[PDB]
Amino acid sequence: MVLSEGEWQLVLHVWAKVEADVAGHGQDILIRLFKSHPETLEKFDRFKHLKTEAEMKASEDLKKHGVTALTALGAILKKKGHHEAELKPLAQSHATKHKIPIKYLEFYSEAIIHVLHSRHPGNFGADAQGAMNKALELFRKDIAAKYKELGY
Ligand code: HEM
């Protein structure tokens, strides 16, 4: 899998819209992740005390973490697949410190795609959803290969 230039344009066009409100996107994505997949919340010592959606929405610290995560993702996307240097540290921490299964990265991808669809219907039609899925799959494929190297 390599994305075409066309596919990259679609991804980065929608991403530039996300960047108008990184914090609101990060909140919506983590919340969707935690509600859809409660096991994910449990990996976060920082957030596992949050028991309701309203509590999640009211946490400034969760918003802060959403900004962190999305900002790293944005830097990866803008490398258009040349993201070896960005991925290495992220794979290392996620495999060896945070203990995040690959499957949980698939759930994370699903959350991103869902939120982009809610917030950007006109810039996120089928073609753009496809391209974004391909980009997120490429990310996951590469992280997975690092996990295997490390024996996760
Ligand atoms: C698009 C996928 C993801 C990106 C870009 C991302 C990004 C980040 C970044 C940039 C950090 C801070 C630096 C570091 O520790 O490496 C971080 C920390 C962390 N990530 Fe992720 N992450 C992703 C997926 C996940 C998922 C799916 C989970 C759990 C289901 C997870 C759990 C965590 C945890 C527990 C921390 C440590 C948070 C703390 O206690 O401060 N991440 N992530």
Measure the CA dihedral 126/129/130/136, to 10°: 180
Q: Which amino acid is at 152?
A: Y
What does the alpha-carbon distance between residue 34 and residue 28 come to, in Å, rounded to a whole number?
A: 10
Instruction: Kindly provide the b/e burial profile for residues 115-140, where b requires at least 16 CB atoms within 10 angstroms of the residue's own CB.
Output: bbeebbeeebeeebeebbbbbbebbb
Cα angle value 16/117/83 (rounded, 5°): 45
What does the alpha-carbon distance between residue 59 and residue 98 come to, in Å, rounded to a whole number?
A: 21
**Residue with CA at minimum distance from ligand 1 atom 15:** 93
What does the alpha-carbon distance between residue 46 and residue 61 come to, in Å, rounded to a whole number?
A: 8
What does the alpha-carbon distance between residue 45 and residue 73 come to, in Å, rounded to a whole number?
A: 22
List of E strands, the chain: none
Looking up residue 142, the CATH number of its domain turns out to be 1.10.490.10
Show the domain range for 7. Answer: 1-152
Give, in order, the Cα–Cα distances in Å from 72 to each of 51, 66, 138: 27, 10, 15
CB atoms within 10 A of CB 45: 8
Instruction: Output the ligand 1 site: residues, CB below 6 A.
Output: 40, 43-46, 68-69, 72-73, 90, 93-94, 98, 100, 104-105, 108
Q: Number of structural domains, the chain?
A: 1
Distance 94 CA to ligand 1 centre (A): 7
Give, in order, the Cα–Cα distances in Å from 33 to each of 48, 83, 86, 137, 140: 13, 24, 23, 17, 16
Query: Is residue 142 within 8 Å of 83, Cβ to Cβ?
Result: yes
Q: Among the atoms of ligand 1, which is closest to the Cα of residue 89? A: 16
